[PDB]
Design a protein around this ligand. Structure first.
Ligand SMILES: NC(=O)c1ccc[n+]([C@@H]2O[C@H](COP(=O)([O-])OP(=O)(O)OC[C@H]3O[C@@H](n4cnc5c(N)ncnc54)[C@H](OP(=O)(O)O)[C@@H]3O)[C@@H](O)[C@H]2O)c1
Ligand SMILES: Nc1nc(=O)c2nc(CNc3ccc(C(=O)N[C@@H](CCC(=O)O)C(=O)O)cc3)cnc2[nH]1
Ligand code: NA
Ligand code: NA
Ligand code: NA
Length: 160
């Protein structure tokens, strides 16, 4: 089973100049960590560059046509290879970026989305999905606080 996990601001913005389009939201990072820990994570090369170190407690699989730049993670050259490299696990977590989400969304059976209540500039977007195809099975609204500058809502959707 393939799942996507992403944080989206207004107009589905996820990235700007190969970085996050907002300052860190520690609550969202905790959500991200809790949902990806002990699972394989698939990411695009640009997202690898934006993170810059292996995510601990996870099998890190990087999708790139280019030779790898770090022996601590697994480099693969195709979507099919990325999936194969995860082996026989219950859930593969696809963690972006925009080009990777586009390719895996049609394969996805679950989405873990953080809706970030911010209008910020972006050059990378989460793909358009048809809400009618998905059932919301979880939602939780949070306000901004001293540590998180924007309000946010966690949602989990399952494909009908
Ligand atoms: N808000 C969020 O939830 C979140 C999550 C993830 C990422 N982001 C942001 O999104 C941005 C990155 O997105 P992006 O679309 O520019 O890049 P990306 O999807 O992370 O990486 C794209 C790169 O991955 C490789 N790739 C993708 N598909 C491939 C395939 N089928 N076969 C071989 N290689 C493939 C290619 O690299 P090569 O050129 O090496 O071949 C491609 O240029 C960053 O700003 C990051 O901060 C945000
Ligand atoms: N919900 C969500 N929020 C994100 O910010 C996010 N970001 C990307 C890619 N960007 C990144 C950047 C940094 C870390 C990171 O340093 N994660 C730590 C956080 C642990 C914590 O702060 O509690 C980790 O161990 O997972 C993960 C993804 C992909 N999916 C996302 N999904
Ligand atoms: Na096996
Ligand atoms: Na197998
Ligand atoms: Na429901």
């Amino acid at each position: 089973m393939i799942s996507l996990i992403a944080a989206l601001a207004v107009d589905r913005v996820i990235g700007m100049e190969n970085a996050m389009p907002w300052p860190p939201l520690p609550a969202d990072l905790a959500w991200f960590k809790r949902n990806t820990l002990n699972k394989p994570v698939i990411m695009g090369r640009h997202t690898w560059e934006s993170i810059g170190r292996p995510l601990p407690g996870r099998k890190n699989i990087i999708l790139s046509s280019q030779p790898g730049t770090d022996d601590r993670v697994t480099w693969v050259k195709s979507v099919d290879e990325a999936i194969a490299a995860c082996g026989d696990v219950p859930e593969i977590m696809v963690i972006g970026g925009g080009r990777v989400y586009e390719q895996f969304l049609p394969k996805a059976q679950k989405l873990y989305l953080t809706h970030i209540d911010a209008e910020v500039e972006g050059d990378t977007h989460f793909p358009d999905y048809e809400p009618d195809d998905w059932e919301s099975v979880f939602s939780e609204f949070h306000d901004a606080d001293a540590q998180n500058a924007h309000s946010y809502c966690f949602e989990i959707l399952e494909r009908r």
